[PDB]
Design a protein around this motif. Structure first.
Motif, PDB file in Angstrom:
ATOM      1  N   UNK A   1       0.918  -1.326  -0.429  1.00 43.08           N
ATOM      2  CA  UNK A   1       0.380   0.243   0.088  1.00 43.08           C
ATOM      3  C   UNK A   1       1.008   1.179  -0.116  1.00 43.08           C
ATOM      4  N   UNK A   2       2.244   1.097   0.932  1.00 45.30           N
ATOM      5  CA  UNK A   2       2.710   2.917   1.136  1.00 45.30           C
ATOM      6  C   UNK A   2       3.174   2.463  -0.075  1.00 45.30           C
ATOM      7  N   UNK A   3       4.262   1.249  -0.868  1.00 44.89           N
ATOM      8  CA  UNK A   3       4.392   1.352  -2.025  1.00 44.89           C
ATOM      9  C   UNK A   3       4.334   1.938  -3.054  1.00 44.89           C
ATOM     10  N   UNK A   4       2.969   0.907  -3.278  1.00 38.82           N
ATOM     11  CA  UNK A   4       1.808   1.377  -4.638  1.00 38.82           C
ATOM     12  C   UNK A   4       1.727   3.129  -4.667  1.00 38.82           C
ATOM     13  N   UNK A   5       1.324   3.589  -2.949  1.00 41.45           N
ATOM     14  CA  UNK A   5       1.049   5.286  -2.997  1.00 41.45           C
ATOM     15  C   UNK A   5       2.368   5.471  -3.173  1.00 41.45           C
TER      16      UNK A   5
ATOM     17  N   UNK B   1       3.557  25.547  -9.999  1.00 40.03           N
ATOM     18  CA  UNK B   1       4.072  23.692 -10.071  1.00 40.03           C
ATOM     19  C   UNK B   1       4.636  23.507  -8.960  1.00 40.03           C
ATOM     20  N   UNK B   2       5.098  24.548  -7.749  1.00 40.63           N
ATOM     21  CA  UNK B   2       5.729  23.850  -5.812  1.00 40.63           C
ATOM     22  C   UNK B   2       4.408  23.821  -5.455  1.00 40.63           C
ATOM     23  N   UNK B   3       3.912  24.297  -5.642  1.00 33.85           N
ATOM     24  CA  UNK B   3       2.085  23.988  -4.987  1.00 33.85           C
ATOM     25  C   UNK B   3       2.088  22.426  -5.793  1.00 33.85           C
ATOM     26  N   UNK B   4       1.683  22.342  -6.988  1.00 30.86           N
ATOM     27  CA  UNK B   4       0.880  21.413  -7.228  1.00 30.86           C
ATOM     28  C   UNK B   4       1.876  19.994  -7.429  1.00 30.86           C
ATOM     29  N   UNK B   5       3.163  20.379  -7.498  1.00 24.33           N
ATOM     30  CA  UNK B   5       3.889  19.045  -7.330  1.00 24.33           C
ATOM     31  C   UNK B   5       4.503  19.297  -6.025  1.00 24.33           C
ATOM     32  N   UNK B   6       4.563  20.047  -4.958  1.00 24.25           N
ATOM     33  CA  UNK B   6       4.405  19.723  -3.597  1.00 24.25           C
ATOM     34  C   UNK B   6       2.749  18.669  -2.931  1.00 24.25           C
ATOM     35  N   UNK B   7       1.726  18.824  -3.865  1.00 31.52           N
ATOM     36  CA  UNK B   7       0.640  18.672  -3.429  1.00 31.52           C
ATOM     37  C   UNK B   7       0.032  17.133  -3.403  1.00 31.52           C
ATOM     38  N   UNK B   8       1.642  16.245  -3.448  1.00 32.17           N
ATOM     39  CA  UNK B   8       1.722  15.188  -3.807  1.00 32.17           C
ATOM     40  C   UNK B   8       1.950  13.873  -2.536  1.00 32.17           C
ATOM     41  N   UNK B   9       2.398  14.523  -1.959  1.00 31.68           N
ATOM     42  CA  UNK B   9       2.557  13.910  -0.676  1.00 31.68           C
ATOM     43  C   UNK B   9       2.385  13.000   0.674  1.00 31.68           C
ATOM     44  N   UNK B  10       0.229  13.813  -0.291  1.00 33.37           N
ATOM     45  CA  UNK B  10      -0.879  13.454   0.835  1.00 33.37           C
ATOM     46  C   UNK B  10      -1.169  11.840   0.461  1.00 33.37           C
ATOM     47  N   UNK B  11      -0.310  11.537  -1.316  1.00 32.21           N
ATOM     48  CA  UNK B  11      -1.301   9.619  -1.322  1.00 32.21           C
ATOM     49  C   UNK B  11      -0.445   8.907  -0.695  1.00 32.21           C
ATOM     50  N   UNK B  12       1.533   9.565  -0.434  1.00 36.73           N
ATOM     51  CA  UNK B  12       2.540   8.666   0.447  1.00 36.73           C
ATOM     52  C   UNK B  12       2.172   8.951   1.518  1.00 36.73           C
ATOM     53  N   UNK B  13       1.730   9.806   2.417  1.00 35.43           N
ATOM     54  CA  UNK B  13       1.195   9.570   3.793  1.00 35.43           C
ATOM     55  C   UNK B  13       0.223   9.119   3.984  1.00 35.43           C
ATOM     56  N   UNK B  14      -0.691   9.044   3.127  1.00 32.15           N
ATOM     57  CA  UNK B  14      -2.211   8.088   3.576  1.00 32.15           C
ATOM     58  C   UNK B  14      -1.771   6.541   3.427  1.00 32.15           C
ATOM     59  N   UNK B  15      -0.988   6.987   2.317  1.00 30.81           N
ATOM     60  CA  UNK B  15      -0.614   4.843   2.147  1.00 30.81           C
ATOM     61  C   UNK B  15       0.757   4.494   3.170  1.00 30.81           C
ATOM     62  N   UNK B  16       1.345   5.612   3.727  1.00 29.74           N
ATOM     63  CA  UNK B  16       2.441   5.115   5.458  1.00 29.74           C
ATOM     64  C   UNK B  16       1.023   5.009   6.696  1.00 29.74           C
ATOM     65  N   UNK B  17       0.304   6.239   6.878  1.00 27.77           N
ATOM     66  CA  UNK B  17      -0.751   5.926   7.665  1.00 27.77           C
ATOM     67  C   UNK B  17      -1.801   4.545   7.461  1.00 27.77           C
TER      68      UNK B  17
END
Lengths: 147, 345, 150, 213, 148, 148, 150, 150, 150, 150, 149
Positions: free
Chosen positions: K87-91, K120-136
């Motif tokens: 899950x965290x790997x796929x996220x 570009x920094x906001x849209x690129x920085x807004x992708x960490x929620x999938x990995x944070x949700x996968x790690x959660x």
């Protein structure tokens, strides 16, 4: 009866590699308008050299078939070593024939282009023949250490 | 790489393509025929090559310019239309796609020449899938895009000229032959990148990708050098897209294409090909001919490859243009100046 | 026992011979002559065939070392420990042979025009040639403990 | 067993997708089946602790018909590119392209090679030609004829493909019948002797598989 | 018992190769017949030569089908798969080779009547691979009825 | 008993071959009718000839479906599947040859009016694989026994 | 029992719905592309989508008839003739939908140039759409024999 | 039994959501290009996305109705008709969405030039819902007989 | 018991994170290309990245509820509804993100030239998110039956 | 005893040698293409091949440390640990070599015309080796518990 | 059983592959963006550092899941860790795959205009929620795997 599959499949890769190497080496002897001076003058070494790969798998398959028998030690099961013994010479003969075909086609193509780089194709193509000897030597060493 | 796949039509098409290329003239025959100057000696010396059948079919007591185009035009129909009728599959589809790619600009030159009172019999020899007796008369005489859409749709398979005719029907390319030729060359390079992207991983293609990548930058530098001192439009499609995105840019080709003395981008992109930054069109054409000739002689000897079919197709047009320029130069009782340097590459 | 693990010795020279064949095949391809000759590139281009064939030379020694430790009849403990050393030298020999093939083709094509690129082109394949020995050391270390099974 | 219909269904399914690959787009071979078979074999072979292998039982006879069928199928495919070379030349010259049909005799002999060994490899039976594991022991002699006939059939198919591949480039090969075409014919003979050498080595290494009782 | 597909595989492969060779010979005859109305009788040799291979797979399928349902065991359904694959591979290869050979012979014979003797000679000589595969299927079918 | 897949495979292969033949005739029918608007009923002969191959798989599926009882052994579920698969493969090969034969017959009949006898002769003769597979499927269905 | 006969009941309506959807998409693409050129041919070009869309009633009626005899528990006798009849009706509806789609796209594309092929285009679709009636008629006979037990 | 009937419930909403997403993407791809040519046709172009998105309710209704039939206990015959009804509704919804995407894009591109061609594109999308209605009716009839005990 | 029911909870967040990542990448590509020509429409075009990235909360909440409803002991039939609901929510989120990315790219590209299709582009992207809500509701209904066994 | 962890030690150096060979080939292609134009950046651009080739030392040291901790008894507490611990370092080294190949080729091609991003490409590779080092730390942590099995 | 080690290494392998693909996609656009002008090379380095931060979640999740591993392997300790790591790997692989295209598009578009670094920094920085949700989700899935027999 499982040990006969390695001896039967031993020269199957060397024959397919030598056939594709002889066909790929013979396919590039078409051009380019000169047949007396340079085609074939020194380009026949890859076609005759690629045919010797099947003899190692054939001799290894004949030695492995003659070495094994139904009244010998075959209750192990230890007959899986003949598949690696035949496939080791078959993969080396197939890779040696496949590299010998591309080296013969590249040497035959680069031979008529420049009259000074003819020794480079023979010197670079001569080293490709030593690839298939390791699988035959390992197959004979593996067959000598068994029953 | 190559020699690992099984192709039944590719072996007969590669052998039939290599058989006509093996019997063709060489650089020694062009260098020997370029030195001599005689109309009677050109027919006897040219009779030994593969063009001696078409040149020997019709000939007179004097050198004519009509027989030179009829010889290469008669040899191109048997060399191009004869292989497509005996082939099928992806090899005949790619061979018809290359002839449709050359016919996208070749048919566009006849469509642009149709307004200038030009017909099928008033056009020079060019690479196409068929002769000018089936599709060239109706396509050249047809000026409407609705008839060209049905004429291009009648041929099998679908060619890329329908999108160029649809974009040219709304006046989205240009009002002259320069913008239509540049957009047709960029669309032909995009179609060659599409077929070369589609049938790419059959064999291991090494010289075809370098020849197409160098031919894209040579075509963009030739299009920018052709419009030099012509007042071209920077916001117009005159920059062909190449695979390089770090060496050659569209702003450097558009700025170098305008008459501003900006040929330093060719010198910065140089040091890798036969071209260089200069102000001579003959030296740039001679360096572009030697740069385009590189990697072309390797395809004439290698077999079982898809890049050799396109390299033989470009070598047939380059040998037909060099033989037509050599025969046209000696046919007028003159010595070649720019064709003599590009006679061997 | 099961008697599984004899294919590990023969599987060593497969990827090494295929990578050395791909490197020696890709080394001869490319532009080597332009008009009538090159700047002594024929004597310099012979090094990538031996450099790609060095991993195939070591693969025969690793496969001979595994074949000497194979034996006619052994336990299931030595058979499972014996297998695995061939794929490590085979994968690194195939990857180093492919990188030596692409580096030999690009270094041969770029080295055909300018002869000064042979110093970096030989150092690229010389630095990429250690992948077969790095896997062959791990294959020899795992093959060294596969003897005397119980 | 279950592998009886699975072996014939996989053998027909491989030649069906292989023959349909060069044909029109109606079906294609599944490339994911090799990775799914390797992952399914390595996954079940890895866990749990158990020996994973197959067991052949009684049939052992498919290599006899598969040898002559593979030799005839391999020999029948080489004449297409070889005979199409002369029609591809056409009216280019009256030279040796119409007199170079000596490779077609070797390509026709490649179909008999392997089929003669398959015909001589059976006598006094059609269900079994040696000791089988259905009424007795020692099924290795009847089992080895399948792999020997399959290897000889594949070698005869490869030599028959190489003969047509040599002849199709060795039709005329320069521009006409002014230069000799024996240079390509020498490579065609060198790629044609591999069928006889592989048939002699496969027939000698295969042993006897006839007169079963 | 699983030798039922072996009798249908010969007619399936021979019908597929004869269908593809008849399709290519019909396409080449239809394309060559437009250029001249005199080559219509000469261009019909590849379809008739390719269509004759179905009788061997039909007779071999009838002979293999005749020994099914009366005397069958666990070891009697193996020869039908090898004979059906043997006749099917030779018929499918001979049909595909006879289609391109008939199209190339029709295209070469469309220019002048010189390549028609060579294409008719190769098409007449291509039946030996089908006859050799049919003889192995007849010899394999004739040697059956060993185990009840 | 699992012989229903062989009974449905004959009508599936015959319907797929007839659909491929009707698609192949309908593909060249618009191109032949677009050239000259004089033949509108002389181009449906390939789809009509290809449509007769579905009656073999339909009659074989109806006759094979009519023999299905309440209690039946597995001895005929492979012999029926071999005859149904052979009839389906023969009908698919005959429909595949009739698909290219219909477009080649319509394209050859569009330019020259003499090619209609050749295209109708090849399209009428292209059902020999389906008839040969249907005869082997009829013999294999007639050779069924050992029910229960 | 096994209870796996629903795949044949769903495969007929899935194959007929997929063939009718692909024929309706392929007919609607050529009808929508040809409708911009001539507005008078819009009513003529719309016949292939509605004619191709009626092929789903055979697989829907066969799936409803085979689904009406199946409840919660059943035997394995119906789950082979139902899978065979649904498998034949699915391939027949898919082949009839593909042929009706190709004939509808070829007729809709050819109808724009010359409006004289409506009789041959309607007769080709009317003659190609009768392929599903054999699979539906065989599916009715298989459904009549698949209701003898349970 | 294993109680694996959730694949039949998720298979309908998976193919229905994939076909509805593909149809909504196909209509939204052509809606933005067709909206630039005429501002009055902006509100008229929104009907194909809502018409294509209506097919997703069949897999959600069949999965929601089949989801309550699972519970905690199961059997060997319960769980087979839901996979055929779910895959049958899913294939018809995915094919209807895939044909509705290209039919909506071609209907928007052809309707962008002339406004009379919108009736054909709306008629093809209105006529393409019959496969989803028949597959939803077959999935409802198959889902109705699946719940007999528990 | 196997106790392998975590793959259904991980597949929902994996499919929702993959669809949200693909929709955020496809919307960010056209948002960056349209933002390169003018930065005024960045705030208007920034809604599709949050709309595509908001779909991950359904798979994350479904995986958190499936992980919370697992317990300390598991059975063989426990990992079915979580796999079906996870696969349905993953396919619905992947199709919703795949349609949201293609709708966002064409919405940003068409909105870059003329700023008038934001009402239809916001309605299509706001209407395409119903598949993740339906699959999340079906995953909650399937998750409601997973808190009683064991 | 029975064990299957022998392939885990040889599987670690395969991905790092393949990614290091692909990064050395991709760096050598751009270094060979950039060395023809200017011979001054040839000595500077050769550092990424030796810097990219150092990633195999972590997998070789992890394979040697995992091979050194091999006992004489095989059980469930020793097997399957070296496959994941070596597979994590192999996948991290393959991903770091795959990113180092495109970073070295793009840095060499961009630095060929105007060299200004050499420190950015070297900092990109030095920042890309931390992904392989992080996987090597987890491979050493999982490899540290591969001994003492009963 | 005893096969949870590949599922434990799959979390760091998926985040390492996604971070490598994001760094390759960032350096690919940065290499073409650096050819136009050498004044924005420092601004384009944010996508590789932002994409490389996703590997720390899979590494810390792999260390935390590896710390709770028991001495005896069974079926209860080799099934939840595979889905938790997957899950965290796929996220992280999906977040790196979106961060690669977002960093390539923002790095390519940032060359002509330097004002797109915020979006570009906001849209690129807004992708960490999938990995944070996968790690959660991987932490909650890893928390229920204790007491393995």
């Amino acid at each position: 009866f499982f040990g006969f599959a390695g001896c039967a499949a031993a020269m199957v890769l060397s024959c397919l590699g030598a056939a594709i190497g002889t066909a790929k080496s013979g396919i590039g002897i078409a051009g380019i308008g000169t047949f007396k001076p340079e085609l074939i003058m020194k380009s026949l070494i890859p076609v005759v050299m690629s045919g010797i790969l099947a003899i190692y798998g054939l001799v290894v398959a004949v030695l492995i078939a003659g070495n094994l028998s139904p009244t010998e030690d075959y209750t192990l099961f230890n007959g899986f070593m003949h598949l690696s013994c035949g496939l080791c010479v078959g993969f080396a003969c197939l890779s040696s024939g496949y590299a010998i075909g591309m080296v013969g086609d590249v040497g035959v193509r680069k031979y008529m282009h420049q009259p000074r780089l003819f020794v480079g194709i023979v010197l670079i193509l001569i080293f490709s023949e030593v690839l298939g000897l390791y699988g035959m030597i390992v197959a004979l060493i593996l067959n000598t250490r068994g029953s | 790489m190559e020699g690992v796949y099984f192709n039944i039509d590719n072996g007969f098409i590669e052998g039939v393509v290599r058989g006509y290329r093996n019997g063709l003239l060489s650089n020694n025959q062009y260098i020997n025929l370029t030195q001599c100057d005689t109309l009677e000696d050109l027919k006897l010396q040219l009779s030994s090559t593969d063009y001696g059948n078409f040149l020997s079919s019709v000939s007179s007591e004097s050198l004519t310019t009509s027989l030179i185009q009829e010889y290469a035009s008669s040899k191109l129909y048997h060399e191009f239309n004869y292989i497509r009728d005996q082939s099928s599959g992806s090899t005949r589809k790619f061979m018809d796609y290359i002839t449709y790619g050359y016919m996208i600009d070749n048919v566009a030159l006849m469509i642009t020449g149709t307004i200038h009172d030009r017909d099928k019999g008033e056009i020079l020899q060019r690479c196409h899938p068929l002769g000018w007796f089936d599709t060239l008369p109706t396509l050249s005489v047809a000026t409407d895009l609705e008839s060209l859409y049905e004429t291009v749709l009648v041929d099998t398979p679908l060619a890329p000229y329908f999108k160029n005719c649809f974009d040219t029907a709304e006046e989205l390319d240009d009002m002259n032959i320069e913008i239509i030729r540049n957009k047709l060359y960029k669309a032909y390079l995009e179609d060659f990148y599409n077929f070369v992207t589609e049938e790419i991983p059959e064999p291991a293609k090494e010289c075809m990708q370098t020849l197409l990548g160098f031919e894209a930058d040579r075509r963009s530098i030739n299009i920018a050098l052709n419009s030099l001192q012509s007042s071209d439009i920077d916001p117009d499609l005159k920059s062909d897209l190449l695979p390089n995105i770090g060496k050659l840019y569209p702003l450097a080709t558009f700025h170098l294409a305008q008459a501003q003395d900006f040929e330093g981008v060719r010198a910065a992109l140089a040091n890798v090909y036969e071209y260089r930054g200069f102000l001579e069109t003959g030296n740039l054409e001679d360096h572009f001919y030697q740069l385009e000739m590189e990697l072309c002689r390797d395809a004439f000897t290698q077999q079982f490859a898809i890049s050799t079919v396109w390299a033989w197709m470009k070598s047939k047009e380059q040998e037909v243009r060099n033989i037509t320029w050599i025969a046209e130069c000696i046919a007028q009782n003159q010595r070649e100046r720019i064709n003599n340097y590009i006679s061997v590459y | 026992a099961p008697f599984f693990g004899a294919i590990g010795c023969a599987s060593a020279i497969i990827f090494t011979s295929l990578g050395a064949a791909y490197g020696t095949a890709k080394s001869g391809v490319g532009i080597c002559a332009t008009c009538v000759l090159r700047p002594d590139l024929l004597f310099k281009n012979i090094v990538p065939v031996i450099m790609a064939g060095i991993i195939a030379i070591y693969g025969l020694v690793v496969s001979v070392l595994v074949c000497y430790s194979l034996g006619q009849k052994q336990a299931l403990y030595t058979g499972f420990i014996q297998l695995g050393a061939g794929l490590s030298v085979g994968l690194s020999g195939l990857a180093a042979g492919f990188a030596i093939g692409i580096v030999g083709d690009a270094g041969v094509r770029g080295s055909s025009q300018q002869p000064r690129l042979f110093v970096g082109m030989i150092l690229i394949l010389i630095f990429a040639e250690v992948l077969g020995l790095y896997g062959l050391i791990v294959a020899l270390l795992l093959n060294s403990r596969a003897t005397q099974d119980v | 067993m279950n592998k009886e219909s699975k072996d014939d269904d996989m053998s027909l399914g491989k030649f069906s997708f292989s023959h349909f690959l060069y044909y029109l787009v109606l079906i294609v071979v599944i490339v994911y089946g090799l990775y799914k078979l390797f992952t399914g074999h390595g996954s079940d072979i890895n866990f749990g602790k158990f020996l994973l292998r197959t067991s052949p039982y009684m049939w052992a006879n498919l290599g006899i018909a598969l040898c002559v069928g593979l030799s005839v199928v391999g020999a029948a495919w080489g004449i297409f590119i070889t005979g199409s070379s002369m029609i591809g030349a056409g009216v280019r010259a009256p030279r040796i392209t119409t007199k170079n049909l000596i490779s077609i005799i070797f390509c026709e002999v490649v179909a008999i090679y392997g089929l003669i060994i398959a015909i001589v490899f059976s006598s006094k039976l059609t269900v079994a030609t040696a000791e089988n594991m259905y009424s007795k022991s020692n099924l290795y002699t009847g089992y080895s004829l399948f792999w020997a006939g399959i290897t000889v059939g594949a070698s005869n198919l490869i030599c028959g493909i190489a003969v047509g591949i040599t002849g199709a480039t060795a039709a005329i090969s320069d521009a006409a019948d002014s230069a000799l075409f024996v240079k390509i014919l020498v490579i065609e003979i060198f790629g044609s002797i591999l069928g006889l050498l592989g048939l002699i080595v496969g027939l000698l290494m295969a042993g006897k598989a006839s007169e079963f009782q």
